[PDB]
Amino acid sequence: AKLETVTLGNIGKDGKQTLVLNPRGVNPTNGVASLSQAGAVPALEKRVTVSVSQPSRNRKNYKVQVKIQNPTACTANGSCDPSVTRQAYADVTFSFTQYSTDEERAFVRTELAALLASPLLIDAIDQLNPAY
Amino acid sequence: AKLETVTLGNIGKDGKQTLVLNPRGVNPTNGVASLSQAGAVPALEKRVTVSVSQPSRKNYKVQVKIQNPTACTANGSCDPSVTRQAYADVTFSFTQYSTDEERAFVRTELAALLASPLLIDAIDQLNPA
Amino acid sequence: AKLETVTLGNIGKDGKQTLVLNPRGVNPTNGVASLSQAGAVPALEKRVTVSVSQPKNYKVQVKIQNPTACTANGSCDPSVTRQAYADVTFSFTQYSTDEERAFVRTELAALLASPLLIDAIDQLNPA
Amino acid sequence: AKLETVTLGNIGKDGKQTLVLNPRGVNPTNGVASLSQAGAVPALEKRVTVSVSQPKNYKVQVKIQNPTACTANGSCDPSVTRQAYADVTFSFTQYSTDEERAFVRTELAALLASPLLIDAIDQLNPA
Amino acid sequence: AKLETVTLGNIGKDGKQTLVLNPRGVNPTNGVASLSQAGAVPALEKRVTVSVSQPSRKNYKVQVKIQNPTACTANGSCDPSVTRQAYADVTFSFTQYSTDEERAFVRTELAALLASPLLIDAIDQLNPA
Amino acid sequence: AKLETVTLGNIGKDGKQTLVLNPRGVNPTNGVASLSQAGAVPALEKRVTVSVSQPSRNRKNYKVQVKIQNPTACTANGSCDPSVTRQAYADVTFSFTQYSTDEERAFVRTELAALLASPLLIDAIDQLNPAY
């Protein structure tokens, strides 16, 4: 759809956060859309890059691909420009066959949007405890 | 945590579905946990394979893979086969100094992009941005 | 221009149809834009692929395509039986003005509503 | 159908033009019909050449062509400076119905009036 | 931003000119946007091609190129040809930590050197410093 | 012309800045003039280097070339001499043919001096949004 200010609400471990994502234009070299936080230092921006795809002569298979990215700013021992210490990526690559219906693609989306709120993945992502 | 019956509720395009996932044991050769639907034909099972990792690597990788096979009975048979295969793949990657609220932000950001009207239009209908 | 939902109205032999075409992104390997119907089975989609070009001669090239779905004698996924293509390849010289290019467009958009080409396309009667 | 004076109305970028096309006979060597403007210099004529075909696949094929006259630096016969072609090659399978062929025609006759192709043909802006 | 009709006003040596630039679409092979004059002969068009970039590289490059062809009808013809070709080229380069007021200073410095009496004498008349 | 104190006025994103540029002499090895800010630490100076050119046996084409440069000072975690953290360049290379008139060269100058105040390049330079 048309890129707009995606106002993601109720994020965070406690559950009371906001994250407005202003649109930052579609990259024409690879079709990758972009979003970014309104924080006005463009190395310290929460980036989100959705990019759907189409079958070429080598794939024959859709790939909706979402990448978020969260840099963390830490001012050093005497400076004025905060640098990027850590970098907390993520990556979601869906893959739907050329005959996939609407309710087979909107099931994998809302399954993954409900595993990430289940107590099995708020314990394997927040605290890095493996499945045991 | 301990693997249990993950009862995922309110799934689907309409929003009224359920999916119980019984635990199917941790693979010891690569640390990959597993979950599966209670549908008692084990080629037609909704699989979910979470697997966190450790630096061998110098970087964590929480990695979740879901998978949905679709059954279609052919023109005269008795065992339905796997026609299509609708994968997904989520590979987080957190640095060795990542706090709790920097890892539980990337999780709840991705769990809120997938309900936004920008990704229920780029996944359900394959319209690009 | 910017790709948007091209809502083509008043199509069909009777003249009362609609066809919304959602944008489906520019192919970067050959510059070919794309459009597609909102019908959520991506083999059964009305595709439209405009692609202008650059030099010793311009080529605005439009391709539409209409697959038809027919469920077989017992199945669940409808297949593509027929395939009704089209192809429009303009070609304008490097000195062509605005009113020499917008004349060939509106000439072809008025031949396809003339009674000479609603009788040579709808019914395949030659001239 | 029978070739007649196709009076194409409301053409042009502004939208107030006419173009009468007198019939100019079917070429018997390749079945290509023809039309031409009443402008009585036969190198400076707006030509239109419809030609349907027969098999393993139909091809309704329309070609328009617009030469532009520019008198040189002292002469009496104006020459053909530029040449603004177009080309529409439909292709319908041997089982195509009437409403599958009259959909591709009226889709293409409505894309060429959409604001996505009056911006990619008149001004050569790509998508 | 979104490409629109950039109506550049008060140009020229005297200072009373206009130049409307209609948008001519983003080239997808290299990300280069384009603008062009409404003069309806497409070899005689004032072209302007802005193109920002991203680190592949570890450094931004906002790059603007304008171009002005001049038409001169020969000794008997009808299509005027391109005799001369007056280019320009502006390649900014901002580091990955550059703020907003460090990038909007280099822009408005260069937009004020080109109206200073040191560069309306080294560009208009080619007198060196 | 003769190098003088170029007092550039009304610069900046808000539009209320000044920048005096004292002349710093013509380099004789390549004809490159120079200007510099009056800030009396000569690594932290806003430099501006105009240099017109002439046809050699390999160019046959004028090149008025302007380069500005803005270093940013950031004192480290305990020191006394501030260092150069970032470096915000620019580069303007005109190129006029040997038959170019006065109003064909003073058009390309005042076109570029009006694109850089247009809302298409105060959005592709200040905020690095590409053309979309």
From Swiss-Prot, chains C, D:
Site residues by UniProt (RNA-binding): 85
Keywords: Capsid protein, RNA-binding, T=3 icosahedral capsid protein, Translation regulation, Virion
Any one GO MF annotation of this record: structural molecule activity
Highest taxon, organism lineage: Viruses
Result, substituting residue 33 to S: In strain: Qbeta_3_FR
Record-level GO cellular component terms: T=3 icosahedral viral capsid
Entry keyword Cell membrane: no
Subcellular location: Virion
TM region positions: none
Result of changing residue 32 to A: Decreased RNA-binding to the viral operator and loss of repressor activity
SUPFAM superfamilies: RNA bacteriophage capsid protein (SSF55405)
UniProt-listed InterPro entries: Levivir_coat, Phage_RNA-type_capsid
Primary subcellular site in the record, as a coarse category: virion
One Pfam family, short name: Levi_coat
Purpose: Capsid protein self-assembles to form an icosahedral capsid with a T=3 symmetry, about 26 nm in diameter, and consisting of 89 capsid proteins dimers (178 capsid proteins). Involved in viral genome encapsidation through the interaction between a capsid protein dimer and the multiple packaging signals present in the RNA genome. Binding of the capsid proteins to the viral RNA induces a conformational change required for efficient T=3 shell formation. The capsid also contains 1 copy of the A2 maturation protein. Acts as a translational repressor of viral replicase synthesis late in infection. This latter function is the result of capsid protein interaction with an RNA hairpin which contains the replicase ribosome-binding site.
Membership in a protein family: Belongs to the Leviviricetes capsid protein family.
Subunit structure: Homodimer. The homodimers binds to the viral RNA via an operator hairpin, but also to many other RNA sequences in the viral genome; this interaction probably shifts the virus from the replicative to the assembly phase and ensures specific encapsidation of the viral genome. Interacts with the maturation protein A2.
Protein name per UniProt: Capsid protein
Biological source species: Escherichia virus Qbeta (Bacteriophage Q-beta)
